[PDB]
Amino acid sequence: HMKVLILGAGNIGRAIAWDLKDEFDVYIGDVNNENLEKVKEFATPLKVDASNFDKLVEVMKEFELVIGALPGFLGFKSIKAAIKSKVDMVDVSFMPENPLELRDEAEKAQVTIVFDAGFAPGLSNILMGRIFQELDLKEGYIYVGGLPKDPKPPLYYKITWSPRDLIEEYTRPARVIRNGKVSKVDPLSEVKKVKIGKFEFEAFISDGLRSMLETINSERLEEWTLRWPGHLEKIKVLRELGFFKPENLDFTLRVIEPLMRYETKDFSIMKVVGKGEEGEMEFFLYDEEDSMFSSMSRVTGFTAAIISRIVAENTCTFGVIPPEILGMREDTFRRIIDELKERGISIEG
Amino acid sequence: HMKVLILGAGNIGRAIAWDLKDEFDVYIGDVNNENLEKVKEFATPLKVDASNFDKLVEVMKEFELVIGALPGFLGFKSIKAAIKSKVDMVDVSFMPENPLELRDEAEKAQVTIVFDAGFAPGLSNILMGRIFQELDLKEGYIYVGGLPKDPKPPLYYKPRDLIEEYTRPARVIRNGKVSKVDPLSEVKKVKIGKFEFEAFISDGLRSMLETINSERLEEWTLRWPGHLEKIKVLRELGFFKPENLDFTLRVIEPLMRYETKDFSIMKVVGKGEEGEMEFFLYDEEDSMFSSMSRVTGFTAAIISRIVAENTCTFGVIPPEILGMREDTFRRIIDELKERGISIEG
């Protein structure tokens, strides 16, 4: 079993570790011990600060694969480290910067990096890429949400993944492709009711499309994030009052985060729609928290691990590769769907 | 000629001194030199710490009237000090405690204390008092606001005392009894004149709760639209909890701090077995004083004159009593008019 290093022992990172524990000798580095304590049984913990770049690259030379599960602010650097250190990487962090900026350096260094390998982006992109190949795509829609099974006031949401990254969904523009071009909207500004199966949600346009903006050529492309009602209106007022400004964000989170940390199971819901000249395609996912992990962890984490296997297998070329590429080729797409099913994540359509 | 002592050179304390400046020999005491400085041209400042009861009574002994313009936490003590000093006092501090508590002591001391002598409570009490006598009153309504003439987003208003209104229970009279309600539970839309407002129940009735024998009594405080919906959310999420409050203010104080002109408005309505009575007033900021300062400070100043004139009896008198008397009520109304404050009805 080859050596693998996962950066970050957060909820996502721990799930990736669990999934890969018997196929690789996995090492997971984090800066927080309490989190590392959680993983000693299945991975070998390392005290690592991804913050320190020259130091990080040194740790990297030992391994043949790195998987990134850091907070978003730290991701671009880790990618940089991997490339300098010449190790293949699969990254899940919700980084603000664009990984494709690093494409040349990656190609030259002959390593392959797959970024945004989570639930959405990630599996989200992969399904779209598939639709993109199978259809002469005109319009694409993604509806996605990680939600609490039993929502509760006052915020009706359960925190399952990094909150700093989460607030960003509300705080910056969301881009879409309208009339064939990229366009920006205020996410908070247009919220609508959508019903999917039994559920009634409020949906807002979000900035999850990411690489798909350049990658998927269609007239219309939008991703909508799903929420229980009552959540967004409250968030909007906070934003309006400046509570999300960087100066106060830490303080505001301290207040609100506890409200969103109550006991409930969580679920994952995704719907992907593709419209073409002759036909439409629709994919659907519903997942729930298992005994060990939240759905968000399962879906984001297992998807990354599955992708990691694909990379370790040498399937892919050098450079920085968007996750939707994986969708576009049949062998890779099918494998992903199959592995997901193995793990109880059933994607339909 | 008559020597008068004002406790606190704050906005209100300052307005009052200004009003009485020609008529009385007015001295004003504070711990804060900056405020003391603002007032030295029309009154004589003194350094007095209201915290010190024994020192307070000693200073008071030199005066024939004391006017209280302190913070609420110091108010009850000031009244006590005046009683011991045997000096009449008019108090405008928004103290938590009930002054009526000191009623026997004041009576024994042969002094007159009028309390809650401001705009609301105060003038509002006086107007309602008129109505209580004139009408067989069953329902009484008071609407009051101190607002920016020009409101800016997101708050639409221009600190702790303000939040406290959102936070604490308010008392009303329902079915002839006192009940406590959440101030934010019943937000309402009301229009007065050319004005569209949002209102919430407030805790201003106070003395009137015992004093006005009525089936329904409520005080509603007015806000420009779009302010309280935001306020409710912040409370809901815990931003108003005491541990978090300091930071919350830091975030939201600035929003409500912008250049504009304030104004004061009041509408008092009384409903009776036969007939309805109603009063209204609108005031604006001026060259020297905000509207709030003018309406509050003047009313207190006017009341002081009445007290200094030996109109009243011994003891602790709720302001509504001044309303209940025709002579007193007229004088107040008339004096207000001279100062540019017109009340109609």
Ligand SMILES: NC(=O)c1ccc[n+]([C@@H]2O[C@H](COP(=O)([O-])OP(=O)(O)OC[C@H]3O[C@@H](n4cnc5c(N)ncnc54)[C@H](O)[C@@H]3O)[C@@H](O)[C@H]2O)c1
């Ligand atoms: N594509 C998607 O669906 C999706 C979904 C969920 C999470 N994510 C992304 O996955 C990344 C992590 O996910 P999470 O929710 O597990 O994050 P988390 O915030 O739960 O934990 C982040 C982990 O990184 C560790 N860490 C922070 N700075 C570090 C440092 N200097 N050195 C070593 N460790 C450090 C933290 O200690 C923590 O253990 C985030 O970028 C998140 O945005 C993406």
Ligand SMILES: NC(=O)c1ccc[n+]([C@@H]2O[C@H](COP(=O)([O-])OP(=O)(O)OC[C@H]3O[C@@H](n4cnc5c(N)ncnc54)[C@H](O)[C@@H]3O)[C@@H](O)[C@H]2O)c1
């Ligand atoms: N009924 C109403 O409409 C109404 C309206 C406005 C104010 N008020 C009440 O009037 C009181 C003062 O009103 P303001 O708005 O002028 O107050 P403000 O807070 O502007 O100033 C209070 C003044 O009290 C002085 N002071 C504080 N502690 C002192 C101490 N230990 N010794 C000497 N002085 C001290 C301060 O130094 C300041 O000068 C407060 O109880 C307020 O609640 C009532």
